[PDB]
């Protein structure tokens, strides 16, 4: 069933999400941080100016936050994403590839912030179920049946493709219009504890140099 | 030259200016320290040849 | 020569069409893996 | 008042070692995409 950390609050209370960045973020990571906020309906953007990690987690817990999102970059290119579940974990770290922001589209327009429909594809292994559990509870429970906004997490060889679309039910099918952003996200670390606790036990780690790392699939 | 540095260049008296000339022309005599006193085109052609071979791969 | 790691996946037009098919294809059947109030 | 001629190229374009660097970058850049 739903994990113990999520079992108490699964389908009872809506989540409270905090999205932040590393110290002295470049400009783009600021915009990219926003697009993550707009992706999660109950997310709020906070500036990490001189904030210290034990101070950040403790301050967020006091305010009642459910999850924290911290983002990293390299020359303004989003490189990593980490999600920490309060009060005692787990903490999942993610690596971003082929990131394409919505500011990077001309005349795109504004997002619809209705509670979105969710699709989780090709998640089979037990670890696959765990990561799905982590990602599912970022969003509100009970999206409206006629909600036009859909978010999909598609697992293709441990590279989860994230897409955002809006659909219109036609007389002879559906037509989906992508809103973005596009980015591929892969798990490489999962710890039983908050992100601050570097000594927290590791539930799972990605072995990158194992000879079968070339062809090993975990999700 | 034993010439005060705060002075302007206009004021200088004759003897000190002559001394300065002697200092410049005879540094070693007054103990001035000594310490104070195609291939690229070939590489370009080789890079072009590598580029052409690289095009040949494709 | 050998490689240690997976190559980063590439989003070709065919990949998008295959992905976009599944996104459309699901919606006919209304099969959305969603959290619901407990 | 003083009069001074303008400095310009008759046909503007929007040393050799420097060109070697740019052609390296273009030649450099292509190599990863094949390797990838």
């Amino acid at each position: 069933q739903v994990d113990d950390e999520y079992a108490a609050t699964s389908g009872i209370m809506d989540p409270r999400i905090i999205v932040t960045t590393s110290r002295d973020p470049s400009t783009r990571l600021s915009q990219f941080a926003k697009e993550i906020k707009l992706l999660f309906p109950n997310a709020v953007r906070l500036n990490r100016g001189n904030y210290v990690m034990p101070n950040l987690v403790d301050a967020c817990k006091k305010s009642g936050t459910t999850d924290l999102v911290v983002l990293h970059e390299h020359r303004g290119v989003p490189t990593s994403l980490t999600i920490s579940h309060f009060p005692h974990g787990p903490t999942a770290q993610f690596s971003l590839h082929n990131v394409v922001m919505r500011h990077d589209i001309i005349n795109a327009g504004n997002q619809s912030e209705v509670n979105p429909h969710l699709i989780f594809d090709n998640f089979t292994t037990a670890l696959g179920k765990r990561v799905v559990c982590i990602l599912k509870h970022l969003f509100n429970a009970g999206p409206k049946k006629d909600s036009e906004r859909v978010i999909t997490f598609a697992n293709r060889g441990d590279f989860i493709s994230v897409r955002q679309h809006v659909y219109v039910r036609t007389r002879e099918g559906v037509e989906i219009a992508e809103v973005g952003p596009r980015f591929e996200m892969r798990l490489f670390e999962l710890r039983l504890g908050t992100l601050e606790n570097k000594d927290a036990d590791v539930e799972w780690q990605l072995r990158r140099f194992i000879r079968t790392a070339n062809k090993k699939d975990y999700l | 030259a034993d010439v005060d540095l705060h002075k302007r260049a206009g004021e200088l008296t004759q003897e000190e200016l002559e001394r300065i000339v002697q200092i410049m022309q005879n540094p070693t005599h007054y103990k001035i320290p000594a310490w104070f006193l195609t291939l690229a085109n070939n590489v370009e052609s080789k890079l072009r040849d590598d580029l052409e071979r690289l095009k040949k791969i494709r | 020569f050998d490689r240690t790691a997976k190559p980063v996946p590439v989003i070709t037009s065919e990949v998008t069409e295959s992905l976009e098919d599944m996104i459309r294809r699901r919606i006919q059947d209304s099969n959305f893996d969603d959290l619901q109030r407990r | 008042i003083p009069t001074h001629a303008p400095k310009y190229e008759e046909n503007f374009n929007p040393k050799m070692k420097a060109q070697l660097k740019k052609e390296r970058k273009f030649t450099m850049k292509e190599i990863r995409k094949d390797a990838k």
């Binding site: 589209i105 001309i106 005349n107 795109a108 037509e175 | 494709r58 | 989003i11 070709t12 037009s13 | -």
Partner: peptide
């Protein structure tokens, strides 16, 4: 269907990396 895929509203230049790969595929 084709019109409403801006990544392939229109994107900034250089977003999509289709031209290289199809040319690599031909090779």
């Amino acid at each position: 269907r084709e019109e409403f895929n801006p990544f392939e509203a229109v994107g900034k230049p250089g977003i999509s990396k289709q031209i290289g790969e199809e040319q690599r595929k031909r090779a």
